[PDB]
C-alpha cells in the first residue's frame, strides 16, 4: 500500500499502483490506462490465489506459463505486482496485459468475415497454436471468448478460466491419453464459424453435442471408436443410430474450396489423422500469409518444479520469488 490505492469493483476490493487509472470491469478482470507505460491496459486479479494447494498451483502455473511464453499471437505479461510488503501479508496477486479489443465472438456477430479476414484470422491462431504446441503445453479450452482480437485483425490467444461446442470428442469420452490435436479440433469448430457466421456444434447436452459431431463427421468404425474413449464412454456412441459422413461442400456452401478442404483435416475424429498446427500453416488456404521463416517455435517448458508435491507456504514462497523477479 505504498503508493497503491483502493477500490471496489466487482464487488471485491483492488489495490492496485496509482499509474494504473480508471479501471472498467470487463469480467475479476479490469481495464484501465497505464501512466507511465502510456497505453490502454488490462488486469487480472486472481481469486483468493493461496486460498488452497490447487489455487496456488494455478497461481504459479498462470504466472509461469505467461512468462515462458512470448510470441505475438499469444498473451504476454506487461507487468505483475501484489499489494503485499512481505510474504505473511502476501495474499493477492495481479497479472497485466496489452487491451487486445474485443473477443472473437464481437468481430462474427457484427460483421460477417471475408474470405481475406478469416485466412488472416485462423493463420494467427494456427501460429499461435504452433508455439503453444512446440512449448508442450495444450490449451484443452479453445473457444471464441478465449482469443482476443484488436481492431487490426490481430490476434492473441488466452486462458480466461459452452466449452462442449468447441471441444474434441476424445475429452468428453474420457481418453485421458489425449495429445496436442485436441485444440487443433477446436480450431475447426472456430474457423467453420467464422465462415457460416454461427457455431458448427451447439449441442444443448453432452448426448446433443455427440448426435451434431456424429452427423457431421460421421459415425466412427469400432476400431476407431475404441482409441478415442474409455470403456464407460463407449455406450454413449453405440447408443446413438449409424449415420453416414457428410461432404463439407454440402455444409459450407459457397466456401474457398481451401478453406472447406483445411476443414476436413482438421475435423476428423481420429486424433492422429489430424493436421498438425505447423502442417495447418503450410495449407495453400494460408498461401497469402505462410512464411516458414516468421512462424517460430517456443522453448521447452520445464514441469520439474510444478512436478512435484509441496505445501502450501511453499507455493506461496515460490510465488512470491516469481512476482518480484518479473
Ligand atoms: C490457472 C491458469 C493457468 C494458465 C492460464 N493461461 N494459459 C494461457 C495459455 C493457454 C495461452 C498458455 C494463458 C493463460 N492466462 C491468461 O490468458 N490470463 C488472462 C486471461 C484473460 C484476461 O483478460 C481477458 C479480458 N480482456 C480481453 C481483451 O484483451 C484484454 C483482456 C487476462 C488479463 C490480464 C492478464 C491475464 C489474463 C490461465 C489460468
Avoid at 479490469?30 to 487480472?44: F, M
Avoid at 474434441?168 to 496436442?180: G, R
Wanted: charge should be negative; aromatic fraction near 8%.
Amino acid at each position: 500500500r505504498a503508493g497503491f490505492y483502493r477500490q471496489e469493483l466487482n464487488k471485491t476490493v483492488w489495490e492496485v499502483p496509482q499509474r494504473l487509472q480508471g479501471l472498467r470491469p470487463v469480467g475479476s478482470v479490469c481495464s484501465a490506462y497505464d501512466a507511465r507505460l502510456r497505453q490502454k491496459v488490462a488486469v487480472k486479479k486472481l481469486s483468493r490465489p493461496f486460498q488452497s494447494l490447487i489455487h496456488a498451483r494455478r497461481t504459479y502455473r498462470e504466472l509461469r506459463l505467461l512468462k515462458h511464453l512470448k510470441h505475438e499471437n499469444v498473451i504476454g505479461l506487461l507487468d505483475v505486482f501484489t499489494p503485499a510488503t512481505s510474504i505473511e501479508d502476501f495474499s493477492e496477486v495481479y497479472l497485466v496485459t496489452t487491451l487486445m479489443g474485443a473477443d472473437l465472438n464481437n468481430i462474427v456477430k457484427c460483421q460477417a468475415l471475408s474470405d481475406e479476414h478469416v485466412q488472416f484470422l485462423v493463420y494467427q491462431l494456427l501460429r499461435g497454436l504452433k508455439y503453444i504446441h512446440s512449448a508442450g503445453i495444450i490449451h484443452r479450452d479453445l473457444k471464441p471468448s478465449n482469443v482476443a482480437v484488436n481492431e487490426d485483425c490481430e490476434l492473441r490467444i488466452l486462458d480466461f478460466g459452452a466449452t462442449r461446442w468447441y471441444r474434441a470428442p476424445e475429452i468428453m469420452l474420457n481418453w485421458m491419453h489425449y495429445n496436442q490435436t485436441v485444440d487443433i479440433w477446436s480450431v475447426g469448430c472456430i474457423m467453420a464459424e467464422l465462415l457460416q457466421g454461427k457455431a458448427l456444434f451447439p449441442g444443448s447436452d453432452y448426448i446433443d453435442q455427440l448426435k451434431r459431431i456424429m452427423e457431421v463427421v460421421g459415425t466412427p468404425s469400432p476400431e476407431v471408436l475404441a482409441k478415442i474413449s474409455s470403456e464407460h464412454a463407449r455406450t454413449y456412441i453405440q447408443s446413438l443410430p449409424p449415420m453416414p459422413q457428410k461432404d463439407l461442400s454440402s455444409i459450407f456452401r459457397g466456401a474457398n474450396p481451401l478453406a472447406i478442404d483445411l476443414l476436413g483435416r482438421m475435423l476428423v475424429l481420429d486424433s492422429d489423422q489430424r493436421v498438425s498446427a505447423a502442417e495447418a500453416l503450410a495449407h495453400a488456404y494460408f498461401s497469402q500469409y505462410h512464411d516458414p521463416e516468421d512462424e517460430p517455435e517456443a522453448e521447452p517448458y520445464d514441469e520439474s518444479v510444478e512436478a512435484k508435491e509441496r505445501t502450501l507456504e511453499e507455493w506461496k514462497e515460490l510465488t512470491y520469488q516469481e512476482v518480484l523477479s518479473f
